[PDB]
C-alpha cells in the first residue's frame, strides 16, 4: 500500500523517517513539501478528492487553523492518547503533537545574570531599554506566545507587557529568529525570545555562540515555558484513514520520536522518550501545561495585540 503526507517540514527532516517507516512496514511514505500556508490552502482546497492522508504541520495555531478549516478527521487512538500529553494534542482529537519546542529566554551571559531573567513579562521592565530583541511579530510561534500570554495573564496585562518590549527594543525585529540569536552573538541584543531548536542548529553548527548567547527558562515560578509542537492528522478525505492512522502512532513511539524530534534539535513529544543530549544540556524547566490549541483560538487576539503595541 502507499500513503501521501503533506508536511510543511523540510523536506530533510521527513526523508529518513518515510524510508524507516517504508522499511518496517513495507508501506511507501510519499512526502508532499510545502509552507504551512499554503500546504493548509491546496489541502481545504484539493476537498473530497484529495491524494493527500496526514497533515504534518508547524505550530498549534497552524494546527487549530487546519482544525477549523474542516481538513482533518478526528481519530479515536489509544496508542496516541497514551504516548502524546493531552496539552500537547487537541482536545477534539483531530491532531497530535509529535515534538516540543520552548519559546524562551536567550541571554549573553558576559552581560546578564540569569538571577536578573524571570519571566516573558520582566523583559518590559525599564531596565532592559535598548537591550531587548526580538524576532518579528509577523510569524506564527510570536502569535502563539502572545496568543497564550493573553490566557494566562488577561488582555489588559499583555497589553502592556508587548507595549514595554517595544519601548525596550534594541534594534528593529529581526526577520528569523537564527538571525535574532546571531545579533546577541554579535553583541547588538543582550536579551531575546525565540524558539529553542534553533539554538540547538546554531550551536550546533558554531559551538562558540555558546559563549556570548544561553537559554533561559521563563516563568518558572508560574505556569511555566511556553511550549509548542508540530503535529500530524489524518486528513478528513483521506482514501486510507486506518494506514495515515498507524503511522501517525508510529511516529509517537519511541524509535520515530529520535529520528523527529532529536534531528531537528527539539524536544520529544513523548515523554518516555528522552531529550538528544544537545537539548538535555540545558537542564530541566516547568513547561505550561495549557493546552496548545489555544494558541490557535487566541490568534486573532494576539494579532490585534501585537499591531496595537507597535511591534513589527
Ligand atoms: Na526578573
Ligand atoms: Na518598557
Ligand atoms: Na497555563
Known amino acids: 500500500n502507499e500513503i501521501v503526507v503533506y508536511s510543511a517540514r523540510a523536506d530533510e527532516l521527513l ?24 500546504l493548509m490552502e491546496r489541502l481545504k482546497a484539493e476537498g473530497k478528492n484529495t491524494q493527500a492522508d496526514v497533515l504534518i504541520t508547524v505550530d498549534g495555531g497552524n494546527l487549530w487553523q487546519a482544525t477549523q478549516a474542516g481538513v482533518l478527521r478526528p481519530i479515536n487512538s489509544s496508542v496516541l492518547k497514551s504516548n502524546i500529553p493531552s496539552h500537547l494534542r487537541d482536545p477534539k482529537n483531530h491532531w497530535f503533537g509529535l515534538s516540543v519546542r520552548a519559546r524562551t529566554i536567550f541571554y549573553n551571559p558576559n552581560k546578564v545574570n540569569p538571577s536578573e531573567l524571570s519571566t516573558y ?31 494566562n495573564h488577561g488582555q489588559a496585562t499583555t497589553d502592556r507587557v ?65 511550549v509548542n509542537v508540530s503535529g500530524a492528522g489524518v486528513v478528513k478525505h483521506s482514501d486510507n484513514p486506518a494506514e495515515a492512522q498507524k503511522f501517525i502512532e508510529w511516529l509517537s513511539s519511541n524509535e520515530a520520536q529520535r529520528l523527529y524530534a532529536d534531528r531537528n534539535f527539539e524536544y520529544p513529544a513523548n515523554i518516555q522518550v528522552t531529550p538528544t543530549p544537545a ?22 487576539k494576539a494579532i490585534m495585540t501585537m499591531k496595537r503595541a507597535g511591534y513589527k
Open 15 to 38: 526523508k529518513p523517517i518515510a524510508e524507516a517507516y517504508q522499511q518496517k512496514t513495507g508501506t511507501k511514505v510519499t512526502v508532499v513539501s510545502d509552507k504551512a500556508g499554503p
Open 121 to 151: 513579562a520582566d523583559l518590559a521592565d525599564p531596565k532592559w531599554k535598548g537591550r531587548l530583541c526580538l524576532r518579528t511579530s509577523n510569524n506564527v510561534y510570536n502569535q502563539s506566545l502572545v496568543a497564550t500570554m493573553i490566557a
Open 162 to 226: 508587548v507595549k514595554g518590549w517595544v519601548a525596550n527594543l534594541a534594534a528593529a525585529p529581526f526577520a528569523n529568529d537564527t538571525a535574532l540569536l546571531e545579533a546577541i552573538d554579535a553583541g547588538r541584543c543582550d536579551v531575546g525570545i525565540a524558539n529553542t531548536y534553533y539554538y540547538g542548529r546554531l550551536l550546533n553548527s558554531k559551538p562558540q555562540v555558546a559563549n556570548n548567547v544561553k537559554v533561559f527558562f521563563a516563568n518558572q515560578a508560574g505556569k511555566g515555558t511556553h
Open 279 to 300: 537539548v538535555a544540556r540545558w537542564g530541566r524547566f516547568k513547561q505550561d501545561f495549557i493546552n496548545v490549541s489555544v494558541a490557535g483560538q487566541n490568534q486573532q
